[PDB]
Amino acid sequence: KKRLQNKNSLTNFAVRCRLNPAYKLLRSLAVLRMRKSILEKSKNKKEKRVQKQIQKKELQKINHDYYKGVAKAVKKKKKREEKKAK
């Protein structure tokens, strides 16, 4: 066959759907879930905080303990070496 212009397979919708027969569904789902969010502004960004209070306070103690232990071990090595110097 005679060669023709090569079409951009990512920005040309017809060829994109020709090559990927499942792209239309995924794009539609993403667009729906994108509009739902903006229609619930002044009503979102509130629940996020009330559940952050639910779980981040549980994760906070574990994280704090981990980093506290790391810093303490780093200090212990320092004192042990300084005393060894004398």
Partner 1 sequence: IEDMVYQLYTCGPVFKKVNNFLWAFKLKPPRKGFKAKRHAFNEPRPGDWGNREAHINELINRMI
Partner RNA sequence: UAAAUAGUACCUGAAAUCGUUAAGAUGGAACGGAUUAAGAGAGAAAACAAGUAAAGAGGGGAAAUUCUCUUCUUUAUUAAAAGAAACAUCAGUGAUUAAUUUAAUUUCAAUAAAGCAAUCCCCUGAAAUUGUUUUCACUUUCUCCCCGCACUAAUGUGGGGAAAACUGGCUUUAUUUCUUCAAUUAUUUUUUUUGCUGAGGAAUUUUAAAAUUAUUUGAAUUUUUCUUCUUAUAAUUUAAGUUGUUUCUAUACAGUACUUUCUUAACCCACUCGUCUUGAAAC
Partner RNA sequence: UUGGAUAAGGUGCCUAAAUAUUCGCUCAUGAGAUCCCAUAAAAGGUGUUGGUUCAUAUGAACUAGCCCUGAAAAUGGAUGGCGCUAAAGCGGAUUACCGAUACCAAGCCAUAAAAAGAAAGAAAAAAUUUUUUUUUAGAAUCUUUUUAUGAGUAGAAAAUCGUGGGGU
Partner RNA sequence: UUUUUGUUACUGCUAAUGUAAAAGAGAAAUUAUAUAUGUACCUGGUACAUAAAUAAUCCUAUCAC
Sign of the C-alpha dihedral, residues 15, 16, 21, 24? negative
Chosen residue from 14, 22, 54, 62 binding partner 1 by CB under 8 A: 22
Task: Name the token pair of 79.
Answer: 């004192």
Site string for RNA, 37-76 (x = CB under 7 A): xx---x-xxx--x------x--xx--xx--xxx-xxx-xx
Instruction: Determine, following the binding rule CB under 8 A, whether residue 20 of this chain makes contact with partner 1.
Output: yes
Instruction: Determine, following the binding rule CB under 7 A, whether residue 14 of this chain makes contact with RNA.
Output: yes
- Secondary-structure breakdown of the chain: helix, strand, coil percentages, each rounded to the nearest 5: 75, 0, 25
Instruction: Determine, following the binding rule CB under 8 A, whether residue 12 of this chain makes contact with partner 1.
Output: no
Q: Which does 54 bind (CB under 5 to 8 A by kind): RNA, partner 1, none?
A: none
Residue with tokens 């506290």: 68
Which run of H or E residues covers position 29? helix 23-39
Q: Which does 19 bind (CB under 5 to 8 A by kind): RNA, partner 1, none?
A: partner 1
